[PDB]
């Protein structure tokens, strides 16, 4: 417009500062499908070690055929919200299937877990209530709590002592309902949350439990229901949120599961559910097929855990410092941010695709490179990757 010139100038300045601080996120164009071997625009094939394709279902032919079948049987889109004319039979079918898979009474579907978390806390909790969140919760949970008028309390990561202290402070504040929100798996450390201690403190202080099993559902546990099956704390965890964009396929969608009263109140008052388009029939059909496929074979889970144990053993032997325990997310702790950036660059030169993270996302100087295992990797590709990692670590004067 007129004054716009100054406005965009400020934005450009900010962008340039982001480039100066070394935090500019650049997207790498992919020309192939989502699998273990990915083709970039430069023509090179690289081994992908930074995708949430834990079970390799993002290119599974059964899911592709189920999506085609869904598009032929129920159409491409709904072009309406759920309560008007966007609810098909496959939606309720997937909801019942998810409720039985997770062991809850009912579920409600969103187009993403971001909107599932955003539309939960404000719909349930008033000013009288209180929310107690782990300090390292996901950004969607943080924004959803920001939309909630409840009393807000945080406790440092996995510090059950601070959790009990904040519970006491919540009771003293006169809180009606108290909700404890936590990720099932902290997506930057590869550590599973201490669910038994949380449930015990909840029963001690009479509080509700919410778990975000986005990085857990599909393979964590005996049936892969999530971390609530990992610690055997089903029926003690009240609300469970999750996504389909991780192990459960990798397309899109989210869900919230709990007793029918909460789910009805969500269908009546959750703003993303009322003012956003319904879930596409292809994704719903593919997710139903995902649930069936996970009921048919635990082979992919065993492959993933074998890959994880092999990676952890071979990388711990070579002198690398690894974090986390008992999960497909294995971070390589590097310390300095520039070291993490150079490690990612060099590993890309050797044909391995990884991503490092520094200050605004993880503390300084605890810079790390988050490698993510996958059931699509074979020990040929795994060993090629691990060898490349050890080569880069030796070249950078890291491991000796």
Ligand X SMILES: Cc1ncc(COP(=O)(O)O)c(C=O)c1O
Q: Residues interacting with ligand X, by CB under 6 A?
A: 112-114, 138, 140, 183, 187, 212, 214-215, 243, 245, 254, 275-277
Residues 125-144 interacting with a copy of itself (rule: CB under 8 A):
138-140, 143
Q: b vs e for 330-357, b when ≥16 Cβ sit within 10 Å of the residue's Cβ?
A: bbbbbeebebbbbbbebbbebebbbbbb
The one of ligand X, a copy of itself, none whose footprint includes residue 215, by CB under 5 to 8 A per kind, is ligand X
Residue 277 engages a copy of itself in binding (rule: CB under 8 A):
yes
Q: Is 214 marked as a binding-site residue?
A: yes
How far apart are alpha carbons 146 and 122 in whole angstroms?
9
Q: Which residues are catalytic?
A: 187, 215, 246
How far apart are alpha carbons 191 and 323 in whole angstroms?
8
State both tokens at 319. Answer: 């002198």
| Piece of the chain touching a copy of itself by CB under 8 A; list 59-67, 153-161, 310-318, 379-387 | 59-67
3-state secondary structure 269-306: HCHHHHCCCCCCHHHHHHHHHHHHHHHHCCHHHHHHHH
Return the residue of 74, 215, 312, 346 that touches a copy of itself, per CB under 8 A.
74
Return the residue of 22, 206, 319, 365 that touches a copy of itself, per CB under 8 A.
206
How far apart are alpha carbons 306 and 44 in whole angstroms?
28
Question: 38-43: long-range contacts at Cβ-Cβ below 8 A with a sequence spacing of 24 or more?
Answer: 38/353
| Piece of the chain touching a copy of itself by CB under 8 A; list 3-11, 308-316, 327-335, 387-395 | 3-11
The one of a copy of itself, ligand X, none whose footprint includes residue 236, by CB under 5 to 8 A per kind, is a copy of itself
State both tokens at 143. Answer: 């924004």
The one of a copy of itself, ligand X, none whose footprint includes residue 11, by CB under 5 to 8 A per kind, is a copy of itself
Q: Is 270 marked as a binding-site residue?
A: no
The one of ligand X, a copy of itself, none whose footprint includes residue 328, by CB under 5 to 8 A per kind, is none
Q: In what order do the strands lie in the sheet with 254-258?
A: 106-110, 254-258, 239-243, 208-212, 178-183, 130-134, 151-155
146 φ, ψ (degrees, to nearest 5) = -65, -25
The one of ligand X, a copy of itself, none whose footprint includes residue 183, by CB under 5 to 8 A per kind, is ligand X
| Piece of the chain touching a copy of itself by CB under 8 A; list 28-36, 151-159, 167-175, 220-228 | 28-36
- In the complex, the smallest distance separating the C-beta of residue 399 from a copy of itself, rounded to whole angstroms, is 25
State both tokens at 105. Answer: 């009474």
Beta bridge partners of 240: 211, 257
How far apart are alpha carbons 76 and 315 in whole angstroms?
45
Residues 87-116 interacting with a copy of itself (rule: CB under 8 A):
87-89, 92, 111-115
Residue 337 engages a copy of itself in binding (rule: CB under 8 A):
no
Annotated binding site for substrate: 138, 370
Annotated binding site for pyridoxal 5'-phosphate: 113-114, 138, 140, 187, 212-215, 243-246, 276-277
């Amino acid at each position: 417009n007129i004054m716009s010139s100054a406005f965009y100038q400020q934005i450009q300045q900010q962008i340039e500062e982001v480039k100066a601080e070394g935090l500019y996120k650049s997207e790498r164009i992919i020309t192939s499908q989502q699998q273990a071997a990915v083709k970039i625009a430069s023509g090179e094939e690289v081994l992908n070690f930074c995708a949430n394709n834990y079970l390799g279902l993002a290119n599974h032919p059964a899911l592709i055929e189920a999506g085609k079948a869904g598009m032929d049987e129920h159409g491409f889109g709904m072009a309406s919200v759920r309560f008007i004319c966007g609810t098909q039979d496959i939606h309720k079918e997937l909801e019942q299937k998810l409720s039985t898979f997770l062991g809850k009474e009912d579920t409600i579907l969103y187009t993403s877990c971001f909107d599932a978390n955003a539309g939960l806390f404000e719909t349930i909790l008033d000013k009288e209530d209180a929310i107690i969140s782990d300090a390292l919760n996901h950004a969607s949970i943080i924004d959803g709590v920001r939309l909630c008028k409840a009393m807000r309390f945080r406790y440092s990561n996995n510090n059950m002592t601070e959790l009990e202290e904040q519970l006491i402070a919540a009771k003293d504040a006169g809180a009606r309902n108290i909700l404890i929100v936590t990720d099932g798996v902290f997506s930057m450390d590869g550590v599973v949350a201490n669910l038994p201690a949380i449930c015990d403190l909840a029963e001690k202080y009479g509080a509700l439990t919410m778990v975000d099993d986005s990085h857990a559902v599909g393979f964590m546990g005996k049936t892969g229901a999530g971390t609530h099956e990992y610690h055997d704390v089903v029926d003690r965890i009240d609300i469970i949120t999750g996504t389909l964009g991780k192990a459960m396929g990798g397309a899109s969608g989210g869900y919230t599961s709990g007793k029918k009263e909460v789910i009805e109140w969500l269908r009546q008052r959750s703003r993303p559910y009322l003012f956003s388009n319904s879930v596409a029939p292809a994704i719903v059909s593919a997710s139903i097929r995902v649930l069936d496929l996970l009921q048919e074979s635990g082979d992919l889970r065993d492959r993933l855990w074998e890959n994880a144990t092999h990676f952890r053993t071979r990388m711990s032997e070579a002198g690398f410092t690894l974090a986390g325990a008992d999960h497909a997310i294995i971070p390589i702790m590097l310390g300095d941010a520039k070291v993490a950036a150079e490690f990612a660059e060099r590993a890309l030169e050797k044909g391995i695709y990884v991503i490092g993270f520094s200050f605004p996302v993880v503390p300084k100087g605890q810079a790390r490179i988050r490698t993510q295992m996958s059931a699509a990797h074979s020990r040929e590709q795994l060993d090629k990757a691990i060898d490349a990692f050890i080569e880069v670590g030796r070249d950078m004067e890291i491991i000796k």
